[PDB]
Amino acid sequence: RLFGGEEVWKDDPIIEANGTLDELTSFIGEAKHYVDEEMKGILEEIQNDIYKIMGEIGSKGKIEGISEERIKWLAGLIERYSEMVNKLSFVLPGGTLESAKLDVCRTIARRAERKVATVLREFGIGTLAAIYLALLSRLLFLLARVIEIEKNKLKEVRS
Amino acid sequence: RLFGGEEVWKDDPIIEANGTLDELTSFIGEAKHYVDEEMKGILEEIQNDIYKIMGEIGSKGKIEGISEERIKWLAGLIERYSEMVNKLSFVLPGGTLESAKLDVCRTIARRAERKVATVLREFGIGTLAAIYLALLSRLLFLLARVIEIEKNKLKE
Amino acid sequence: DSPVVEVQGTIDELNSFIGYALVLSRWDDIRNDLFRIQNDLFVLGEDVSTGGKGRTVTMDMIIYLIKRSVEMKAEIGKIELFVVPGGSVESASLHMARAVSRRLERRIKAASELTEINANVLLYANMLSNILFMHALISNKRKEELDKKLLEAARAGQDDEVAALLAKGADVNASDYKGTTPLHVAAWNGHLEIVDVLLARGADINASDSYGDTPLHLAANYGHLEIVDLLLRWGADVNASDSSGKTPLHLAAQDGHLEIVDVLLAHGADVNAQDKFGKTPFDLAIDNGNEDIAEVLQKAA
Amino acid sequence: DSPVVEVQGTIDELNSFIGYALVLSRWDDIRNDLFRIQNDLFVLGEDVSTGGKGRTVTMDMIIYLIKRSVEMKAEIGKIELFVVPGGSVESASLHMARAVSRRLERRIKAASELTEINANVLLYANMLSNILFMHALISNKRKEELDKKLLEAARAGQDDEVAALLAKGADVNASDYKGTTPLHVAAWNGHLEIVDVLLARGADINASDSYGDTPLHLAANYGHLEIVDLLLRWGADVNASDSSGKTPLHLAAQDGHLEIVDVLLAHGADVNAQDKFGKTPFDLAIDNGNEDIAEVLQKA
Ligand SMILES: [Ca+2]
């Protein structure tokens, strides 16, 4: 069994959506090692939610995915962090190294949102997953700006 | 010649498989700087094999690609490292930073396996390459889990 | 469901060919591989039929086909391209099993365009075509293994090795590059015991080497009378011509063998046959100083 | 009219396979059926070509395929499904003839969709595929029939039965369920005459049974020097390892055969080789009380 594992050799919306989500959760696991304890726990919960979404999509809707409580949790974080981000007109991506990782994760989340949207159009399954991914890209953007602001504010203290 | 270099402006199955493999070998090159000496050498041999697969695919089978000895080499490593991983039901991806890098490499290897499978369907070239890529995703998964085990064992 | 049936009929067809080359191949490791292939052709068919519901072609199945394909490419070494099929029966059956296996790929490549087929089906199909080819190569390397020992054992007078070799399928008519066959070597050296066991297995009683010599030539040339009789009793050509044109009577007349000249003349040797030098058996007897042979040829008219 | 041609080329193709398995199958009744099938494959072709004007496949033709198919299913008994093909050559040739026969059905089922083809064509075709399968079953039942008789005659010392059996196609290398071959049984009992004719047909001189014993092992175990001599002359493994791992020299030293220990040593026996109990040929000679064997191994 060891030599085989799991093998995927076809291109269809379900396979593409799950692969992008697998890419998204792998990059989040990489990025969670550059943030503080609070953001690390948040990112791990997001990884668990992505597994539920993959379980729903990989099961073609037979297996239950995320719940509406998870979407509310993402929305509360977005609302909480939007107050802190005094709106910046434009910021170059990658203000800090940690912010750059989150921007990469946001782009993969946006692509995953597009792929899952294709699945929803084709099969009618995955409305909650699409909503979660839209909120996730917005939240990832907000976290990068917050990291830049907090790191910049400590830079103003050392001078 | 310097201004020009290499330029690619078309979307076909052959082009997509080579581009994804370039991403895979680039990410493996990034991840090899986070592993120990043994795993770094393993990842470098994999990079040469990925280059061989690209040579086969980019030549549409005229140029010889990987050999069956390379696939046996991957299988031996998978067999050797599967014994160490006492089966864990599930572990969240990115347990450590090095494990996270290997998980990123595994996802790109799985996607590259899908693209090369498309090439095999379209042209009938790359059977050995597809087998190597399937075993490579399993080996990358096994290596990530082993990294997790070693950091946990030092915690004990 | 039309395309999946033709694959089933070709998978089933290949299994008949595989089982045939199995019962022919006299080596244990080849038959072990072939039997696993046969039991795997069931799973491979069950994979295409159920579309993935029942048994499925696993990667460990494909991996085993490569493990053996590497182990065999080591014993073979360099694999010459553009090689003609049908080397030996055990090998030739494997060549035909390969050609059917490659047809199953063509049947699979068609059906996959009409129904989702797990990729491992064509992967195992492609690996089966390869590993069958190594089977045929090894079969011929070992057929040339025994035949190079039969020519060796026939030279060294290995009455027991020639027995084990011919009992294990060493081609009795195995021709060297010189054209020398084990029957030639047995008459040359003079091991009468091997000459019979070779002719019993079906030795070519009048094989010609590069020189054009027949076993009866060598038997008459080197004074082994006992072999001259049994060769002629089996229908050896008593007036065969080599490149020089000399008959067994010429060679027996040159080297001073009266009792062999008497036997070759009895079964119909030609006193009047001439080599390319115009010299008759009556000449070559006079040329070599052998007199009692010339009068037997002189009074033969 | 292109599809009716492919059927003709497959009928002609199957006829080549049928005639091949005919010249292979060494029984009269199988060849009897196979010959009618060949002469009927002509009529079956003429039926597809003429569309029913000339010769036609009759129901009596299909009827005879079933009369024989019942007579054979009676002798077989229960027919296990999912059995691997290619049992023996007479059977294997029939298996391949069957696979071609089933392909002719697929060529007929296709062509019938493009030109009217008398149903008896496919009925005889479908019955032919079945009856070829009974032929292969019977061929293996009778090939396995002789092999249990060759293994039996090799036990009782039937020098005359082995002659008729090996001449009638009884597999000389026939392995019993124990893993025992006729060469094992002949060396075991000590019927030297059978050992010769068995090796002449090409017996596996060092076949291993479940215990791992070789013909040279059993010949050395039961004190048949004449059998030990000829086995070694054919290249028998003088230091073969069984499940115990004892070599012929071990077994010949255990049971007190000096002339076999000496002859096995001449062809390269191992004086110091150890079994799984650590006892060497010098040990097992001492363990069983044979001293003249221990001194020859000690001086080695
Ligand atoms: Ca990417």
Tab-separated table of N, CA and C in Angstrom, chain A residues 1-5 7-10 12 15, chain C residues 57-60 63 67 116 118-120 123:
chain	number	residue	atom	x	y	z
A	1	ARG	N	0.822	-1.205	0.000
A	1	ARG	CA	0.000	0.000	0.000
A	1	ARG	C	0.858	1.257	0.000
A	2	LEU	N	2.066	1.136	0.552
A	2	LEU	CA	2.925	2.301	0.731
A	2	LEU	C	3.314	2.923	-0.605
A	3	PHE	N	3.684	2.091	-1.583
A	3	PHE	CA	4.125	2.606	-2.877
A	3	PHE	C	3.033	3.434	-3.541
A	4	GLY	N	1.780	3.029	-3.375
A	4	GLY	CA	0.678	3.683	-4.049
A	4	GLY	C	0.200	4.986	-3.447
A	5	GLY	N	-0.227	4.949	-2.189
A	5	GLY	CA	-0.833	6.126	-1.588
A	5	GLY	C	-2.062	6.556	-2.370
A	7	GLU	N	-3.453	8.696	-5.764
A	7	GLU	CA	-3.053	9.129	-7.096
A	7	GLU	C	-4.247	9.745	-7.814
A	8	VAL	N	-4.047	10.929	-8.389
A	8	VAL	CA	-5.096	11.662	-9.093
A	8	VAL	C	-4.604	11.979	-10.502
A	9	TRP	N	-5.360	11.538	-11.513
A	9	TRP	CA	-4.979	11.740	-12.911
A	9	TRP	C	-6.186	12.131	-13.769
A	10	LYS	N	-6.831	13.246	-13.437
A	10	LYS	CA	-7.878	13.771	-14.306
A	10	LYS	C	-8.088	15.241	-13.978
A	12	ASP	N	-11.023	17.910	-13.777
A	12	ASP	CA	-12.469	18.222	-13.737
A	12	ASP	C	-12.638	19.257	-12.611
A	15	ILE	N	-11.717	18.228	-8.939
A	15	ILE	CA	-10.278	17.947	-8.670
A	15	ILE	C	-9.506	19.272	-8.597
C	57	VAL	N	-6.854	-1.685	-10.106
C	57	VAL	CA	-5.426	-1.844	-10.365
C	57	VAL	C	-4.676	-0.923	-9.408
C	58	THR	N	-3.925	-1.512	-8.481
C	58	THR	CA	-3.190	-0.748	-7.484
C	58	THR	C	-1.823	-0.349	-8.029
C	59	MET	N	-1.207	0.630	-7.369
C	59	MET	CA	0.130	1.042	-7.781
C	59	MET	C	1.173	-0.004	-7.410
C	60	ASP	N	0.964	-0.725	-6.304
C	60	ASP	CA	1.859	-1.824	-5.959
C	60	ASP	C	1.891	-2.885	-7.050
C	63	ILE	N	4.143	-1.267	-9.549
C	63	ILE	CA	5.486	-1.184	-8.974
C	63	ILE	C	6.194	-2.532	-9.069
C	67	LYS	N	9.835	-3.452	-10.614
C	67	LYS	CA	10.861	-4.118	-9.817
C	67	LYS	C	11.491	-5.269	-10.590
C	116	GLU	N	-14.580	6.866	-18.502
C	116	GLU	CA	-13.486	7.093	-17.573
C	116	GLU	C	-12.880	5.755	-17.181
C	118	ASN	N	-9.579	4.235	-14.940
C	118	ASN	CA	-8.517	4.568	-14.003
C	118	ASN	C	-7.169	4.495	-14.703
C	119	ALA	N	-6.338	5.514	-14.473
C	119	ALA	CA	-5.086	5.627	-15.214
C	119	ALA	C	-4.207	4.402	-15.004
C	120	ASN	N	-4.209	3.851	-13.788
C	120	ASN	CA	-3.435	2.649	-13.495
C	120	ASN	C	-3.749	1.497	-14.441
C	123	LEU	N	-1.446	2.270	-17.213
C	123	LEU	CA	-0.092	2.166	-16.680
C	123	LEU	C	0.326	0.707	-16.529
